[PDB]
C-alpha cells in the first residue's frame, strides 16, 4: 500500500526499508535502543550515536524496543510542537496504539485531562487498567464520528486544546470541530495530507495552530533540532514517565507470522521480533552475533576498485549503474573512442556527483602492455576487486565473405583481451574477487553468419573454466538478446540484471540466460 520512494531520502533499494527501532548491544557491549530511518530489521544496524539511548537496568531489551519511536513522536508532537501546558484538555485518537499510549503517559504526567478513542471494548478495559486516572467519561469510539458529540458535551461545548489526530476522511473533519479557541491541531497521519484534501479555513478565526508533524525529517535532516527531543526522552526515561508498552514477541524465523499478526489488526501494544536472545551479562563484549541462513546477494567493498572493459557501451553502462548501487565507489571504464554521446556524459557526471570516483580510460586490453596499464590505473585508484570483460567488435557475414582480417578484428577484444586480462590478474591482483566475461547463445546454440563471433565467445569460456579449476575466480555468462540497450525474444535489462545477481553466487563456471519466443 506504500511505495518505497515515499520514505524520505534516496535509498534506491526498493526494499530493506522495513523496521525503524531496535534494541541491542553496542559495539562495546552497552545495552542501547536506537532509531534508524530505515533498515531496522537486521542482525546489525549502522546508526549515529545521536540516535542511541541507554537502556536503564530496570528494563529488559524486549521492553526497550517499544519506547523509541512512539515516545519520540509523542514528545515531539506535544512538548515541542503543541507546547502542551499543565491543566489543558486534549484528545488523543487510537489510545490503544503506541503513539496514543505515549501521548497519554506524557499528558497524565503534566496533569492534563484526556479524552481517548478506542475501537473495541477490550482496548477500553486495557487502557483503564494501565492508567487508573482515566474515568468512564474519558472514552469514545474511534470507528465513527460520535466522539465529537461526546467531547463537545463533556467539555461544556468549549472543546479541547490539543488534538493528536491519526484518523482520516470524515473523522479528520470531525476532529477539527472539537477544537477550542487557542487550540492546536497535531496531525500525524498521512492520508488526507497525501491526497491534498481541502480544509475549511474558517476554523482559524478561532486562534488555531494547525500542525503538520512528520518525525521522518529529523532522521535525514534537522540534526540540531533533534537533540531537544532526545533530551526530552532521556528526562522521561529517568523520571519514570516513559514506561515500556506491552510486547508480543515473535521469533526471528517466524517474521511473516508477525507481519500477518500486525495485519489482522487485533494487537494491543507493540509487536516485536526477537532476532536474538538477551544474556544475563550486563556487558557481554561479544565478538559477533550468531549466524543465520539468509539468501545470498552481491555487494562490494568501498575501498575496492572495479573495471568494466567496454564500459562506455550501453550494456556496460547499465552494469555499472547496477554496480554503483551495490557499493562500488571507484570504477574504471575502457573504450577506444572515449565519451562521445550525451547519454554517457550524463551518466558519468551523475555518478561523479554521487561521489563515485569514475575514470574513463583508453588502454586497449588487446595488447598485454595495455592490460598492465589498465590494471595499474585501477591499482592507483585502489586494490582491484573485479574485471568485467564486455568488449565486442562485430563483423558479421556468412563464411563465404569472411576473411582472416575480420576474424582477427573480432577476436582481439574478446579472446586476446580475456587472455591478457587473465595473465595480468594472475600476476598482479591478489585481492581480486570477481572475474566475469559476457558471451552469447550464438556460442552454445550456434547462429548463421556469426561464425567469427561464436568462435570468439567460445574461447572465453575455456579461459574461465581453466581459472575456476585453478581456484581463482571466473565466470562466463551466455546471454540471448538484450532488450533496452536464434529465435529468442529480447530480454529486458531488469530481468538480465536480476539474473546476473543470481549467477555471481552459483558455483558453476559457464551459465546462460535467454527467453523463448512464444
Amino acid at each position: 500500500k506504500l511505495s518505497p520512494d515515499a520514505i524520505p531520502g534516496k535509498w534506491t533499494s526498493q526494499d530493506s526499508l522495513l523496521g525503524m527501532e531496535f534494541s541491542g548491544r553496542d559495539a562495546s557491549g552497552k545495552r542501547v535502543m536506537g532509531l534508524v530511518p530505515a533498515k531496522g530489521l537486521a542482525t546489525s544496524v549502522l546508526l549515529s550515536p545521536d540516535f542511541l539511548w541507554d537502556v536503564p537496568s530496570n528494563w529488559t531489551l524486549e521492553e526497550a524496543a517499544s519506547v523509541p519511536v512512539v515516545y519520540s513522536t509523542a514528545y515531539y508532537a506535544l512538548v515541542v510542537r503543541g507546547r502542551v501546558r499543565p491543566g489543558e484538555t486534549l484528545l488523543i485518537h487510537s489510545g490503544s496504539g503506541g503513539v496514543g499510549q505515549a501521548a497519554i503517559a506524557i499528558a497524565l504526567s503534566l496533569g492534563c485531562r484526556v479524552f481517548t478513542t478506542v475501537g473495541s471494548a477490550e482496548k477500553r478495559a486495557y487502557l483503564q487498567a494501565r492508567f487508573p486516572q482515566l474515568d468512564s467519561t474519558s472514552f469514545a469510539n474511534s470507528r465513527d464520528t460520535s466522539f465529537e458529540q461526546h467531547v463537545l458535551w463533556h467539555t461544556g461545548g468549549k472543546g479541547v486544546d490539543l488534538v493528536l489526530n491519526s484518523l482520516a476522511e470524515e473523522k479528520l473533519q470531525a476532529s477539527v470541530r472539537c477544537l477550542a479557541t487557542h487550540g492546536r491541531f497535531l496531525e500525524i497521519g498521512k492520508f488526507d495530507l497525501s491526497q491534498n484534501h481541502p480544509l475549511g479555513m474558517a476554523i482559524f478565526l478561532k486562534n488555531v495552530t494547525f500542525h503538520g508533524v512528520l518525525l521522518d525529517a529529523f532522521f535525514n535532516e534537522s540534526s540540531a533540532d533533534w537533540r531537544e527531543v532526545w533530551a526530552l526522552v532521556q528526562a522521561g526515561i529517568r523520571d519514570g514517565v516513559v514506561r515500556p508498552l506491552k510486547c508480543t514477541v515473535f521469533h526471528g524465523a517466524q517474521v511473516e507470522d508477525a507481519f500477518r499478526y500486525m495485519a489482522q489488526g487485533k494487537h494491543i501494544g507493540k509487536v516485536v521480533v526477537q532476532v536474538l536472545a538477551e544474556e544475563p551479562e550486563a556487558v557481554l563484549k561479544g565478538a559477533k552475533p550468531k549466524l543465520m541462513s539468509a539468501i545470498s546477494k552481491t555487494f562490494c567493498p568501498a575501498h575496492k576498485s572495479y573495471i568494466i572493459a567496454g564500459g562506455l557501451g550501453g550494456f556496460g553502462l547499465e552494469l555499472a549503474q547496477w554496480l554503483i548501487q551495490r557499493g562500488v565507489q571507484k570504477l574504471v571504464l575502457t573504450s577506444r573512442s572515449g565519451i562521445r554521446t550525451g547519454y554517457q556524459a550524463k551518466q558519468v557526471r551523475r555518478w561523479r556527483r554521487q561521489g563515485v570516483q569514475v575514470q574513463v580510460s583508453t588502454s586497449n586490453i588487446s595488447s598485454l602492455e595495455g592490460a598492465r596499464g589498465l590494471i595499474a590505473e585501477a591499482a592507483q585508484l585502489g586494490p582491484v576487486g573485479g574485471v568485467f570483460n564486455l568488449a565486442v567488435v562485430l563483423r558479421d557475414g556468412l563464411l563465404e565473405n569472411q576473411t582472416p582480417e575480420f576474424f582477427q578484428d573480432v577476436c582481439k577484444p574478446k579472446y586476446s583481451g580475456t587472455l591478457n586480462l587473465d595473465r595480468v590478474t594472475r600476476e598482479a591482483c591478489p585481492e581480486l574477487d570477481y572475474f566475469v566475461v559476457f558471451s552469447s547463445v550464438s556460442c552454445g546454440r550456434g547462429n548463421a553468419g556469426q561464425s567469427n563471433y561464436g568462435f570468439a565467445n567460445s574461447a572465453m569460456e575455456r579461459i574461465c573454466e581453466k581459472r575456476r579449476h585453478e581456484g581463482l575466480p571466473g565466470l562466463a555468462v551466455q546471454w540471448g538478446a538484450i532488450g533496452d540497450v536464434s529465435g529468442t525474444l529480447p530480454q529486458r535489462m531488469a530481468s538480465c540484471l536480476e539474473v546476473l545477481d543470481l549467477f555471481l553466487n552459483q558455483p558453476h563456471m559457464v551459465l546462460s540466460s535467454f527467453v523463448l519466443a512464444e
Binding site: 511505495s3 520512494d5 515515499a6 534506491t12 526498493q14 491534498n196 525474444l489 530480454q491 529486458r492 530481468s495 527467453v515
Partner: protein, 68 residues
C-alpha cells in the same frame, strides 16, 4: 527511478495565438518548439503552454513478469 504518473497540476494556461507565433520551422520541413523546465519555479513552458505545480506520484510496477 521507477515510473511516475501525473496526479495533480496546479494551473495550466494555453494560448493558440502565442503558440502559432512561437513555433519556428527547422531546416527540414518539421516544425519545432523550444521548451524550458525550471524546477526552482515549478513551471514547464513550451510555445503557448504553461504548466505550473505539477505533482507526480510513483506507481507500483505491474509485476506482470511476462518474461520468465
Amino acid at each position: 527511478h521507477g515510473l511516475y504518473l501525473p496526479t495533480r497540476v496546479t494551473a495550466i494556461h494555453i494560448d493558440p495565438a502565442t503558440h502559432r507565433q512561437k513555433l519556428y520551422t527547422l531546416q527540414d520541413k518539421a516544425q519545432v518548439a523550444d521548451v524550458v523546465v525550471s524546477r526552482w519555479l515549478r513551471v514547464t513552458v513550451a510555445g503557448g503552454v504553461h504548466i505550473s505545480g505539477l505533482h507526480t506520484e510513483s506507481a507500483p510496477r505491474r509485476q506482470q513478469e511476462q518474461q520468465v
